[PDB]
Amino acid sequence: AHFKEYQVIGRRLPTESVPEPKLFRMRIFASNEVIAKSRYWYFLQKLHKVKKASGEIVSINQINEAHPTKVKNFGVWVRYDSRSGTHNMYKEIRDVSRVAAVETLYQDMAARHRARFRSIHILKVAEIEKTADVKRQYVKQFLTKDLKFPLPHRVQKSTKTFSYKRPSTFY
Amino acid sequence: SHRKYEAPRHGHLGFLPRKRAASIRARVKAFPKDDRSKPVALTSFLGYKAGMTTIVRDLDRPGSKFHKREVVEAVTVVDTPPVVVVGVVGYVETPRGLRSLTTVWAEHLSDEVKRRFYKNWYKSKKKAFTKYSAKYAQDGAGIERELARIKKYASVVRVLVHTQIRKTPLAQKKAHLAEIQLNGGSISEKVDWAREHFEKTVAVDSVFEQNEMIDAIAVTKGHGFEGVTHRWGTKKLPRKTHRGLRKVACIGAWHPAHVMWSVARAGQRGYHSRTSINHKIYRVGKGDDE
Amino acid sequence: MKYIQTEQQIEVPEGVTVSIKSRIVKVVGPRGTLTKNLKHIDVTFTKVNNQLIKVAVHNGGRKHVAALRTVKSLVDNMITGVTKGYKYKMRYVYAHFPINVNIVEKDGAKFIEVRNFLGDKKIRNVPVRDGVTIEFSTNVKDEIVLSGNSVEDVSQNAADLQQICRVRNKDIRKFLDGIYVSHKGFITEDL
Amino acid sequence: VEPVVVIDGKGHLVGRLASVVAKQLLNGQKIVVVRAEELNISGEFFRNKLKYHDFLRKATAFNKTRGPFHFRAPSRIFYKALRGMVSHKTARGKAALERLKVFEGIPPPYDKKKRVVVPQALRVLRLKPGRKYTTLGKLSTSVGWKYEDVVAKLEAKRKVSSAEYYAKKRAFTKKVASANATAAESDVAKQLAALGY
Amino acid sequence: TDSIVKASNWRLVEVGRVVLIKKGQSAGKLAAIVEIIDQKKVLIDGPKAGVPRQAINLGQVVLTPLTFALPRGARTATVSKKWAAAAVCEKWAASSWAKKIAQRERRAALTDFERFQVMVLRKQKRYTVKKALAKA
Amino acid sequence: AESHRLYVKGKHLSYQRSKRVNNPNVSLIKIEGVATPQDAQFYLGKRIAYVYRASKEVRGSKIRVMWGKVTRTHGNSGVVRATFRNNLPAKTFGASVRIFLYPSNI
RNA sequence: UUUGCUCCACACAAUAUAGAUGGAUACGAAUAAGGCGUCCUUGUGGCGUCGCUGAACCAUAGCAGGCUAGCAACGGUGCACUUGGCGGAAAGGCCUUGGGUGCUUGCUGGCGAAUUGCAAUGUCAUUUUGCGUGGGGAUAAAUCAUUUGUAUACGACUUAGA
RNA sequence: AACUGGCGAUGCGGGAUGAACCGAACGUAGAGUUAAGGUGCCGGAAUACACGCUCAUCAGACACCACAAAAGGUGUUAGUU
């Protein structure tokens, strides 16, 4: 479904030798709490010597966007697996939320490179709003000044199967 | 596996089914292309094949190694008494083809043409075209209206003619009736020509001329049921052949598990409609002289 | 990629007028009128100041922007044809057999007839499209000139001459014989 | 809804229109389709010609007269599509195909009546602009349909007749509207308008 | 003589262009395009009409012929202020599109007695109009 | 005046079925003008008559009738599921049926 | 070879209706464009307006629609004739000046309905037949048998024969 | 050959068709809900909604499975310096 931003913070199991472990935190986009904990444990296994049995999760909190109703450019650094090897890439997308931003990021990854959520890692998602910082033409073309354009060839959906006059695609 | 040695197929695949023609008289399948500039004229004629004979003529072929010398040629003489035109039909062009709109006949119909319309002519009341002539037999009763219909419609005009079987030496007494397209002038001109020529003779000296290439349409001589050897020209099987040698040895492979349409089979030979083209008229002559 | 807006500008001379319906454009000036149907490209036109026409493509791909460039170039070519006109000069190049080029008129159709190319009995016949005039230029020999209003028509006539004058069954690098497009320019060039 | 539905084929995609019409016939609606020669197929004309050439290649080895019958007419091409989408070997399929009628051009009983459109199958509404398409009449003439010119002439004649009819109807309707304006602004008209008609 | 080109202008999407959201939680309500996210989506606001600030698709909204001046990215309060200043809803209601929508809505909201009254009034109007056609 | 229809036209389309097995005890009905399950809900629980004519007079009439009712919806396009006193003859696929306004709730 | 056959209306009997229960309600072309109206150098023209679905437009009140009266009827709408036409793509339909009658809910009235008993489809508009109800109507062919040979295994074909 | 599960011995829904695959195992009926598989029409079910990519003069279309490779193409799309 639509992803949700979670902060998941957990530690290794406190032993007698070393109480109060380092309390590692992660920001991850997942469908819900179960997949959030799963992804947190997967990444913490990829990074540090700890597994789910040997550790615990001390907190998992959803993070709502500070302002979900303003347009901001998003720079997403990701790494993904292809049929041949692993590649890092950087994309920029115009969107109103980080969660919707990773929604479109995953959709575009699947569309353009056949990469699945299985194969995609989101390294970083950064909100930006400065022009001349975005590097992609398919974003700068909308960040141009006084952007107005028509929508040629409007197609109107019909409920009935039969229409009694030829359609007009004006707008 | 492949044939050990290649050879052309026996017979023509465009001339089958080798079945009997639907009638003794072979109709013109396609008339010559219509031209409106040229005057209205018959595109065909009906004759009777009289026989064959020999002619001697000086060949004029400027470049042959044996040019300007006498040659002997075989010619076919056909008896062509002037065909009596009576009747005219109209054809409108439709998304389905040429559809016959109406046919208008003439006042008097010949006894021979009525015999053509009949089967048991002698034991009959001879009631044919009687009420048609009653609708006719006036100046403008109802035939001029049909003429106007053929003028307003019927992009193709075909006159109806019948042969003079009484003039010919045949013992038939039954006229042959056919349609001839008029490939000149507008539809109005075609209909006017047909009406003026209603109930009268057209001469082949007016239709065709000397030094002309024409097409003969006829039903070939019938030969009945025939085997493959003479029907298609297949090889005769060797002398030491059990249960027959005038046959096709292999009539198909194991697969497809069917005899194919292209395999030569015994059946009817002759009596097929045929249109031979490019026959040069060597003479158009009349019998009203020696 | 889907470039949101691609706009281009075509200038018109002061002595020419352009009428643009849906996608059928006519241009009329000193040398006459030319017409073009562009109903296969989906490009919008606008007038700026009676001397500038903007040609626009919205949400177009690479092919669509290429088509926008093509339509701008085509309308430019037709405008310069209506103003100055096009002239294609061709040379006959032969090694041994002089190429005899003349103009015949069957029912007034203005055919071009080529004889003696490589000493053959062939008669190479080329129809002349409308709006194309054939002149055998003086002060120079084995020269033909096709002058017209439509660059496409004059160039296709010249290409027809080249295609008939193509040589067969021989090494072309030795048998360079043929009628070749030497010059393509304007009738009002350097005027 | 209606006893008979008449759809013109011009601007319609053959497959989508055939599917819609087949479903309607199975549901029990009589349908006639005109302008089958102006029906459209998505894809290049060469692509559709190659497809029809493969169809022509398909034929029974031992008897082409019992093999598949490759009808060349545009209306019969549309009928072939519809019969492929209808289960034609059962009595229900025979009933649906009896309910269906297809024509090239518009014969009198249907050009004197109303023609509807199917937005789900319309080329303009469906195909992405710039995508190449094919005309059924051109494809049929290429594969051996012999009556494109006759249908074109008859359609031109019908179009002039319909243009004159439309001019007469438009003049009558505009006179009716002018007289309605003169007799308008009455209590009845104001009451209907204020009520909501 | 002047070179002439067909106008070919039709309802550009822009900031301040007011749209009619047709499906969803509003379903027939006025809003204003506050910002253009992509070619297929825009951030819109409908504070006066009752449409919350939201990212929507131009395939979900319908642009309307009229618009008004509005800085891009304007908040809900500013959009409402400029909407009231420009009287966008009054112009929309004056437009024949909204009159058609309201007529359709009421005609659907009619009762059976009202339908009978419509029938009687229409018969009267038909009588008068036929008399006028005959007199003309 | 000329119109006396107190029912709503519908079409008996087919039986409840999988790809290769049908259930004659349940029939599918397409109500005319209904294109959504939302209107199908209003049409739920409503009597249906299949009226046909026979050449033989049975009980003072040459018209026979089968009674059933719209019970629940079927799909996303306004098709409803009907159960009749006797299952429809299956030759009446795509056949005219009448849906009555009773038992009324409005 | 003791009214057979055609056309035109009708109590009554139809393997019965692939399934009417107000109307299949007629420009074309384009869709990165159109429709209508208007104005003129009548043109790829200026201007105004419309769409954003048919949720439309016609027709729709009356014993399944009765009987009987009025008001400006200078209208609307069923039925039957010729005059004037148009329509051949499958025309079989589309119009039109005429005369007689009905009805009219455009507006106002008077009388009747019940008991089908709380609902039962509650029955309304096709191809033919009859020792029919009668008005017009001109009273034939084919086959077998015989014969022919342009044909042919037999059939069939091509002819002839009061 | 090993472990397990199946077919043999077993129907049923799906994979068009199939002993083994996927679901699920079976008395006679009714209602509801699903599994696997699907919802353009055949064919019951969205000519759904959303984002992209692809135009093939041998497209591609759903495991078992009914085939395709090395190599190459500013065709087009997206990605460090």
Side-chain angles (χ1 to χ4, degrees), chain A, chain B residues 1-87 90-91 93-97 99-290, chain C residues 1-188, chain D, chain E, chain F:
Chain A
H2 183 215
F3 278 101
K4 250 180 290 221
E5 176 89 276
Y6 292 87
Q7 67 114 0
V8 186
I9 140 182
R11 56 186 187 162
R12 291 167 64 134
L13 264 200
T15 91
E16 35 273 58
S17 171
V18 47
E20 279 136 308
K22 282 305 116 199
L23 227 64
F24 306 111
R25 172 184 178 276
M26 275 201 113
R27 304 185 43 133
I28 44 184
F29 306 86
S31 330
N32 56 68
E33 314 235 0
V34 185
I35 311 77
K37 298 207 258 270
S38 209
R39 292 316 276 174
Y40 169 79
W41 279 131
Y42 161 87
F43 283 130
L44 210 77
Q45 254 174 74
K46 288 207 134 40
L47 304 162
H48 210 208
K49 172 65 143 272
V50 50
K51 43 198 201 174
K52 187 203 164 253
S54 56
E56 78 167 356
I57 282 170
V58 333
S59 158
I60 171 185
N61 317 53
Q62 105 261 18
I63 315 162
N64 317 273
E65 190 103 74
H67 312 258
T69 43
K70 33 199 64 143
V71 201
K72 38 206 175 283
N73 331 299
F74 280 111
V76 200
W77 292 262
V78 298
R79 82 175 258 187
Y80 88 107
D81 288 358
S82 38
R83 323 205 225 272
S84 331
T86 315
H87 330 275
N88 320 273
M89 32 211 294
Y90 165 72
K91 322 263 295 212
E92 307 176 306
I93 60 194
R94 240 192 143 196
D95 185 329
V96 91
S97 301
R98 286 169 65 84
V99 282
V102 309
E103 187 50 29
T104 83
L105 186 270
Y106 273 108
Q107 252 48 261
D108 194 55
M109 279 288 80
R112 304 194 126 97
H113 305 279
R114 318 297 177 191
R116 283 91 171 151
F117 173 92
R118 158 206 328 151
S119 303
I120 297 152
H121 290 166
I122 272 69
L123 309 177
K124 190 207 324 154
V125 179
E127 169 187 334
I128 210 78
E129 53 97 14
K130 272 71 67 172
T131 321
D133 172 356
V134 32
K135 303 159 173 239
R136 297 314 183 223
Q137 249 291 294
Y138 54 76
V139 188
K140 293 188 259 125
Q141 84 171 22
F142 298 122
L143 314 158
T144 206
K145 175 179 52 63
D146 262 297
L147 173 87
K148 65 179 51 55
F149 52 90
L151 286 165
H153 204 66
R154 146 159 84 152
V155 165
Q156 329 216 7
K157 217 204 189 210
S158 88
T159 90
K160 299 137 79 96
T161 160
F162 298 125
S163 176
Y164 311 65
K165 88 185 302 172
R166 319 291 312 214
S168 47
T169 63
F170 89 106
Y171 209 7
Chain B
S1 35
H2 60 285
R3 341 169 61 169
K4 203 177 190 56
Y5 302 94
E6 217 76 24
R9 94 165 314 273
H10 291 281
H12 201 295
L13 287 175
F15 279 105
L16 56 105
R18 305 281 209 71
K19 65 144 49 148
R20 298 151 191 196
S23 43
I24 187 52
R25 174 197 53 106
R27 310 146 291 100
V28 160
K29 296 291 191 60
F31 288 93
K33 219 72 81 159
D34 212 330
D35 201 323
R36 292 328 173 74
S37 297
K38 302 326 288 143
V40 200
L42 284 193
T43 62
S44 184
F45 206 89
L46 268 87
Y48 289 89
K49 173 156 184 208
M52 270 195 96
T53 206
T54 297
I55 65 107
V56 153
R57 74 162 184 116
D58 266 44
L59 176 70
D60 174 46
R61 173 134 63 232
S64 160
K65 256 62 72 203
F66 318 89
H67 153 247
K68 265 175 159 34
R69 312 217 263 121
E70 187 247 332
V71 293
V72 158
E73 314 225 282
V75 306
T76 301
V77 190
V78 294
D79 192 3
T80 70
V83 295
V84 169
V85 22
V86 47
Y91 288 90
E93 55 221 5
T94 79
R96 265 105 67 79
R99 182 186 88 81
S100 179
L101 183 93
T102 206
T103 332
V104 196
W105 308 81
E107 185 57 11
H108 328 317
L109 273 301
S110 198
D111 266 347
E112 31 196 351
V113 82
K114 307 206 332 161
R115 291 168 89 113
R116 167 58 58 188
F117 296 128
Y118 274 92
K119 226 129 187 69
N120 299 298
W121 163 262
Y122 88 107
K123 54 171 188 81
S124 94
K125 296 298 207 67
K126 323 296 198 48
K127 292 279 276 301
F129 290 85
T130 63
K131 326 178 121 174
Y132 186 84
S133 267
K135 184 213 304 226
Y136 221 137
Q138 283 90 47
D139 49 0
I143 272 75
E144 68 310 316
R145 268 193 297 279
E146 318 288 270
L147 291 186
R149 301 239 315 289
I150 310 188
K151 263 160 198 257
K152 181 183 195 179
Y153 312 114
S155 71
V156 171
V157 180
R158 260 172 224 192
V159 80
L160 282 152
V161 303
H162 75 84
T163 67
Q164 310 235 56
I165 213 54
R166 142 201 72 91
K167 288 218 170 271
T168 205
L170 253 65
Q172 166 140 332
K173 271 189 251 166
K174 201 157 156 169
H176 276 100
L177 178 77
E179 318 199 347
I180 318 198
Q181 208 170 264
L182 308 161
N183 273 346
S186 89
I187 299 303
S188 152
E189 282 171 286
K190 294 176 215 276
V191 170
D192 291 350
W193 189 99
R195 249 270 287 162
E196 219 295 342
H197 276 54
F198 260 6
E199 234 183 277
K200 60 207 317 203
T201 80
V202 175
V204 73
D205 86 320
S206 90
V207 173
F208 301 103
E209 306 98 344
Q210 162 106 356
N211 296 306
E212 219 199 49
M213 295 296 228
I214 67 164
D215 315 349
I217 293 104
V219 177
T220 76
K221 204 253 173 212
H223 290 108
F225 212 88
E226 178 83 284
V228 301
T229 305
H230 205 270
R231 188 184 195 223
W232 298 96
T234 69
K235 222 73 163 140
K236 258 175 76 157
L237 298 180
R239 210 271 330 293
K240 34 155 59 186
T241 310
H242 191 36
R243 60 199 136 213
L245 62 94
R246 294 192 61 101
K247 276 139 76 179
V248 162
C250 180
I251 68 158
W254 196 318
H255 278 108
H258 302 88
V259 186
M260 291 226 330
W261 65 283
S262 65
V263 182
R265 312 235 81 198
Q268 158 84 13
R269 176 167 74 97
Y271 208 70
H272 310 313
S273 189
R274 290 283 188 272
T275 300
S276 293
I277 73 182
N278 288 337
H279 291 306
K280 179 166 262 299
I281 291 106
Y282 273 10
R283 170 166 297 215
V284 178
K286 340 221 183 83
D288 49 28
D289 53 343
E290 314 84 296
Chain C
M1 168 66 214
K2 252 50 77 173
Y3 306 89
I4 176 72
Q5 259 262 351
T6 325
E7 181 203 349
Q8 285 198 12
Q9 263 316 2
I10 151 189
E11 322 280 354
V12 328
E14 286 262 281
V16 73
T17 151
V18 186
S19 205
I20 294 183
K21 202 29 179 166
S22 148
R23 263 149 21 213
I24 168 77
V25 47
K26 56 184 311 304
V27 33
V28 32
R31 306 208 111 238
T33 316
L34 289 163
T35 341
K36 174 157 284 266
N37 186 82
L38 280 163
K39 292 241 221 300
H40 44 89
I41 278 154
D42 278 67
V43 53
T44 319
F45 301 89
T46 320
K47 157 174 153 169
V48 186
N49 51 50
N50 168 80
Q51 297 272 118
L52 258 180
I53 289 119
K54 97 161 227 183
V55 204
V57 164
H58 304 107
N59 207 35
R62 241 174 97 75
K63 300 316 191 33
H64 217 178
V65 194
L68 165 76
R69 270 297 317 91
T70 297
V71 307
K72 181 246 173 92
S73 268
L74 286 166
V75 185
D76 270 32
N77 284 15
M78 93 185 331
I79 271 182
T80 86
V82 132
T83 58
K84 295 172 164 5
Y86 293 89
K87 158 166 51 196
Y88 276 40
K89 308 142 76 161
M90 320 201 48
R91 317 272 292 111
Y92 332 132
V93 184
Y94 46 98
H96 191 271
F97 293 104
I99 292 159
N100 286 98
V101 182
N102 304 302
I103 283 66
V104 309
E105 291 89 355
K106 295 136 91 214
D107 62 65
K110 280 258 205 114
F111 281 92
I112 296 201
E113 253 206 353
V114 181
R115 333 185 92 141
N116 205 8
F117 175 61
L118 269 274
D120 72 6
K121 307 286 121 181
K122 256 55 148 209
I123 287 197
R124 277 147 219 263
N125 209 339
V126 173
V128 160
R129 290 86 194 296
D130 49 8
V132 194
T133 94
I134 313 309
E135 66 165 330
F136 286 146
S137 160
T138 84
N139 77 72
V140 71
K141 66 142 53 210
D142 47 74
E143 182 112 345
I144 189 176
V145 169
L146 313 96
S147 37
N149 241 36
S150 261
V151 50
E152 334 174 13
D153 281 328
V154 281
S155 29
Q156 197 51 85
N157 234 359
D160 285 340
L161 272 73
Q162 265 222 65
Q163 290 319 292
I164 63 183
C165 89
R166 81 154 279 221
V167 126
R168 251 174 38 102
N169 280 124
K170 319 272 135 199
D171 173 350
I172 49 178
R173 316 169 305 177
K174 186 62 157 65
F175 287 84
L176 322 176
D177 278 67
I179 295 164
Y180 292 108
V181 170
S182 158
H183 285 1
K184 333 163 181 160
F186 281 145
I187 323 167
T188 321
Chain D
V1 293
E2 304 311 47
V4 180
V5 163
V6 178
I7 315 141
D8 72 359
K10 152 146 183 305
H12 289 78
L13 304 164
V14 61
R16 320 220 153 213
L17 182 62
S19 175
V20 173
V21 171
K23 195 38 166 168
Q24 295 284 328
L25 301 160
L26 283 172
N27 291 339
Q29 178 79 96
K30 304 238 194 48
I31 280 153
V32 351
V33 172
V34 300
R35 318 281 281 292
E37 83 288 342
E38 251 299 321
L39 263 159
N40 271 130
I41 299 118
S42 92
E44 277 222 42
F45 166 78
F46 215 91
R47 294 250 326 161
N48 298 127
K49 219 214 171 194
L50 288 182
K51 291 196 174 183
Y52 205 96
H53 278 338
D54 306 356
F55 179 48
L56 275 171
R57 165 169 173 51
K58 275 134 210 65
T60 283
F62 67 96
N63 205 9
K64 275 79 180 308
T65 71
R66 65 195 322 153
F69 304 130
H70 321 94
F71 287 77
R72 314 312 162 88
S75 57
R76 317 299 316 151
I77 291 175
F78 177 79
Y79 192 84
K80 193 238 153 166
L82 196 142
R83 164 181 130 139
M85 316 194 201
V86 165
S87 161
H88 67 106
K89 293 199 203 198
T90 62
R92 187 162 152 270
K94 314 239 188 58
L97 296 160
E98 268 142 37
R99 294 196 260 274
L100 171 75
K101 285 194 196 325
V102 204
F103 304 89
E104 282 108 19
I106 322 154
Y110 310 119
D111 71 354
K112 208 76 59 151
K113 298 168 154 337
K114 175 70 150 136
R115 279 141 263 133
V116 317
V117 102
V118 181
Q120 330 183 313
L122 274 165
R123 197 213 69 246
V124 275
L125 294 204
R126 286 302 312 195
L127 268 205
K128 201 216 271 280
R131 281 274 134 73
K132 308 255 207 86
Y133 52 94
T134 304
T135 310
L136 204 33
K138 178 170 169 213
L139 171 73
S140 285
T141 303
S142 69
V143 301
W145 175 51
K146 331 217 261 206
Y147 312 97
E148 178 152 43
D149 282 21
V150 159
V151 166
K153 267 230 316 193
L154 291 169
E155 276 286 280
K157 182 170 78 176
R158 164 204 91 72
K159 280 196 196 19
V160 202
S161 287
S162 167
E164 274 73 327
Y165 158 78
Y166 172 69
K168 226 187 83 63
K169 183 198 90 123
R170 207 201 65 280
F172 177 81
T173 278
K174 76 198 190 52
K175 184 31 56 143
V176 165
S178 185
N180 197 307
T182 62
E185 71 264 6
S186 57
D187 49 345
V188 166
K190 283 187 278 280
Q191 265 144 4
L192 283 158
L195 166 147
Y197 261 54
Chain E
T1 314
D2 50 351
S3 36
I4 165 171
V5 183
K6 197 54 203 190
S8 62
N9 44 0
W10 63 110
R11 224 170 292 190
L12 324 98
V13 338
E14 40 162 271
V15 163
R17 164 73 90 226
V18 337
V19 306
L20 185 84
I21 177 49
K22 70 189 138 93
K23 98 192 57 191
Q25 288 39 39
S26 313
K29 290 201 190 133
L30 287 167
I33 297 190
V34 152
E35 207 154 335
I36 309 184
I37 308 171
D38 280 304
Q39 198 273 357
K40 314 186 75 102
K41 39 207 199 93
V42 283
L43 150 69
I44 59 107
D45 224 332
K48 177 286 208 273
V51 195
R53 222 180 160 78
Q54 76 196 263
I56 201 137
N57 302 37
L58 312 155
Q60 255 153 15
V61 300
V62 192
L63 310 159
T64 50
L66 79 182
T67 179
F68 69 111
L70 190 46
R72 86 157 217 283
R75 235 85 65 76
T76 296
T78 285
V79 162
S80 145
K81 163 130 142 201
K82 317 285 207 87
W83 191 295
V88 201
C89 282
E90 322 199 358
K91 299 170 164 231
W92 165 254
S95 83
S96 169
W97 184 358
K99 313 220 283 299
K100 183 43 191 313
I101 276 168
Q103 160 184 276
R104 206 206 286 124
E105 257 176 18
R106 137 65 83 171
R107 178 185 307 215
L110 285 164
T111 191
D112 215 14
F113 188 39
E114 268 150 9
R115 289 199 279 293
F116 185 75
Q117 298 165 250
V118 172
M119 218 267 267
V120 174
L121 288 189
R122 267 203 286 171
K123 288 182 105 173
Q124 281 157 240
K125 171 119 187 314
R126 204 182 41 182
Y127 191 94
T128 88
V129 83
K130 294 293 202 326
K131 159 137 65 52
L133 266 288
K135 297 296 152 94
Chain F
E2 55 192 340
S3 159
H4 298 110
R5 193 176 38 105
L6 254 287
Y7 62 82
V8 201
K9 289 172 227 154
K11 296 292 216 147
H12 176 223
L13 311 173
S14 98
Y15 292 145
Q16 172 183 37
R17 66 175 291 164
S18 100
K19 193 176 308 260
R20 243 46 201 176
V21 158
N22 60 40
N23 172 68
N25 298 293
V26 166
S27 298
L28 303 182
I29 305 284
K30 179 165 160 126
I31 313 157
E32 230 80 69
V34 171
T36 195
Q38 278 39 74
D39 325 313
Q41 324 261 237
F42 168 90
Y43 267 102
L44 245 47
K46 287 238 173 313
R47 298 233 56 101
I48 300 202
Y50 173 56
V51 170
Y52 59 98
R53 340 192 61 111
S55 103
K56 174 230 261 189
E57 211 211 70
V58 155
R59 218 95 164 158
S61 164
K62 261 161 188 93
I63 291 148
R64 297 177 217 196
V65 52
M66 224 153 300
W67 276 102
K69 69 223 294 218
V70 174
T71 69
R72 67 182 274 216
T73 73
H74 187 71
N76 298 309
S77 290
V79 168
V80 302
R81 255 188 257 191
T83 309
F84 293 84
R85 271 206 249 288
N86 332 98
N87 312 335
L88 292 195
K91 195 194 265 139
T92 80
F93 284 172
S96 267
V97 102
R98 340 201 178 178
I99 303 139
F100 296 100
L101 310 173
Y102 52 81
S104 106
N105 203 102
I106 73 199

